[PDB]
Scaffold this active site. Structure first.
Site, PDB file in Angstrom:
ATOM      1  N   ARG A   1       2.478  -8.322   4.930  1.00 46.25           N
ATOM      2  CA  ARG A   1       2.141  -7.253   4.003  1.00 46.25           C
ATOM      3  C   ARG A   1       3.409  -6.527   3.655  1.00 46.25           C
ATOM      4  O   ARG A   1       4.137  -6.050   4.529  1.00 46.25           O
ATOM      5  CB  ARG A   1       1.135  -6.306   4.669  1.00 46.25           C
TER       6      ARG A   1
ATOM      7  N   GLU B   1      -4.799   3.631  -6.291  1.00 47.12           N
ATOM      8  CA  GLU B   1      -6.168   4.001  -5.919  1.00 47.12           C
ATOM      9  C   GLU B   1      -6.919   4.158  -7.187  1.00 47.12           C
ATOM     10  O   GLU B   1      -8.106   3.817  -7.238  1.00 47.12           O
ATOM     11  CB  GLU B   1      -6.239   5.333  -5.157  1.00 47.12           C
TER      12      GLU B   1
ATOM     13  N   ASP C   1       1.316  -0.299  -2.960  1.00 44.54           N
ATOM     14  CA  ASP C   1      -0.090  -0.651  -3.031  1.00 44.54           C
ATOM     15  C   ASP C   1      -0.482  -0.704  -4.490  1.00 44.54           C
ATOM     16  O   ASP C   1       0.126  -0.089  -5.355  1.00 44.54           O
ATOM     17  CB  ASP C   1      -0.948   0.354  -2.286  1.00 44.54           C
ATOM     18  N   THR C   2      -1.599  -1.364  -4.744  1.00 42.71           N
ATOM     19  CA  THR C   2      -2.325  -1.169  -6.018  1.00 42.71           C
ATOM     20  C   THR C   2      -2.795   0.281  -6.095  1.00 42.71           C
ATOM     21  O   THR C   2      -3.348   0.811  -5.125  1.00 42.71           O
ATOM     22  CB  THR C   2      -3.579  -2.007  -5.971  1.00 42.71           C
TER      23      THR C   2
ATOM     24  N   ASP D   1       1.037  -7.930  -2.956  1.00 40.11           N
ATOM     25  CA  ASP D   1       1.757  -7.348  -1.826  1.00 40.11           C
ATOM     26  C   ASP D   1       1.440  -8.009  -0.476  1.00 40.11           C
ATOM     27  O   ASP D   1       1.813  -7.483   0.558  1.00 40.11           O
ATOM     28  CB  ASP D   1       1.589  -5.827  -1.757  1.00 40.11           C
TER      29      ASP D   1
HETATM   30  C1  LIG Z   1       1.552  -1.219   3.903  1.00 39.07           C
HETATM   31  C2  LIG Z   1       0.785  -0.834   5.150  1.00 39.07           C
HETATM   32  C3  LIG Z   1      -0.571  -0.965   5.224  1.00 39.07           C
HETATM   33  N1  LIG Z   1      -1.268  -0.665   6.396  1.00 39.07           N
HETATM   34  C4  LIG Z   1      -2.669  -0.748   6.486  1.00 39.07           C
HETATM   35  C5  LIG Z   1      -3.347   0.526   5.911  1.00 39.07           C
HETATM   36  C6  LIG Z   1      -4.615  -0.019   5.329  1.00 39.07           C
HETATM   37  O1  LIG Z   1      -5.656   0.053   6.316  1.00 39.07           O
HETATM   38  P1  LIG Z   1      -7.208  -0.053   5.977  1.00 39.07           P
HETATM   39  O2  LIG Z   1      -7.452  -1.551   5.751  1.00 39.07           O
HETATM   40  O3  LIG Z   1      -7.886   0.478   7.203  1.00 39.07           O
HETATM   41  O4  LIG Z   1      -7.471   0.719   4.706  1.00 39.07           O
HETATM   42  C7  LIG Z   1      -4.335  -1.513   5.043  1.00 39.07           C
HETATM   43  C8  LIG Z   1      -4.223  -1.715   3.534  1.00 39.07           C
HETATM   44  O5  LIG Z   1      -3.845  -3.048   3.250  1.00 39.07           O
HETATM   45  P2  LIG Z   1      -4.237  -3.830   1.937  1.00 39.07           P
HETATM   46  O6  LIG Z   1      -3.785  -2.890   0.848  1.00 39.07           O
HETATM   47  O7  LIG Z   1      -3.406  -5.113   2.007  1.00 39.07           O
HETATM   48  O8  LIG Z   1      -5.747  -4.020   1.959  1.00 39.07           O
HETATM   49  O9  LIG Z   1      -3.079  -1.818   5.674  1.00 39.07           O
HETATM   50  C9  LIG Z   1      -0.527  -0.158   7.499  1.00 39.07           C
HETATM   51  O10 LIG Z   1      -1.253   0.149   8.523  1.00 39.07           O
HETATM   52  N2  LIG Z   1       0.811   0.035   7.462  1.00 39.07           N
HETATM   53  C10 LIG Z   1       1.522  -0.255   6.297  1.00 39.07           C
HETATM   54  O11 LIG Z   1       2.703  -0.042   6.288  1.00 39.07           O
HETATM   55 CA   LIG Z   2      -2.895  -6.561  -1.999  1.00 38.23          CA
END
Ligand SMILES: Cc1cn([C@H]2C[C@H](OP(=O)(O)O)[C@@H](COP(=O)(O)O)O2)c(=O)[nH]c1=O
Ligand SMILES: [Ca+2]
EC number: 3.1.31.1
Length: 136
Positions: A35, A43, A40-41, A21
């Site tokens: 992104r 949890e 997401d993967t 992703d």
């Molecule tokens: C998809 C997405 C992720 N994010 C943030 C939340 C997560 O924050 P934290 O890193 O603080 O957990 C992070 C997860 O991305 P990854 O799943 O690529 O690591 O991206 C957003 O802020 N808005 C979004 O729409």
């Molecule tokens: Ca990823």
């Protein structure tokens, strides 16, 4: 209900596939990490991460045309990654991941929710098929 807006697809080119992703694209002449919205993967199930990455790498690398579609909300996250729907020859990578049970719908913010029900439709069908992440 949220406001709604007409989104549009913008041109981009692949620089490097990263994982399920994330993808690195040349967008308006500069490299940018994107992104994918709304996925997401899981949890509680990370078994399919490698397969998800391989899937999107192939899809992105084989595509003749990549397009970026920002939603109506935040265009970047807190890390300055672009937040978009990514298309590979007209196929939405975000949707493909979900329909194939390779990632789940997640990070659903009201701000960037235009394709939420589309992706939930895809998810419900992967879940019905007990496909991949949904297999247990
Ligand atoms: C998809 C997405 C992720 N994010 C943030 C939340 C997560 O924050 P934290 O890193 O603080 O957990 C992070 C997860 O991305 P990854 O799943 O690529 O690591 O991206 C957003 O802020 N808005 C979004 O729409
Ligand atoms: Ca990823």
């Amino acid at each position: 209900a949220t406001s709604t807006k007409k989104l549009h697809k913008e041109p981009a080119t692949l620089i490097k596939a990263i994982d399920g992703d994330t993808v690195k694209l040349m967008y308006k002449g500069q490299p940018m990490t994107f992104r994918l919205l709304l996925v997401d993967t899981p949890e509680f199930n990370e078994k399919y991460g490698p397969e998800a990455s391989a899937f999107t790498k192939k899809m992105e690398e084989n595509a003749k045309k990549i397009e970026v579609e920002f939603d109506k909300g935040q265009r970047t996250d807190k890390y300055g990654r672009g937040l978009a729907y990514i298309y590979a020859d007209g196929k939405m990578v975000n949707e493909a991941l979900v329909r194939q049970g390779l990632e789940k719908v997640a990070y659903v913010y009201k701000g960037n929710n235009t394709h939420e029900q589309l992706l939930r439709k895809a998810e419900a069908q992967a879940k019905k098929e007990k496909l991949n992440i949904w297999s247990e």
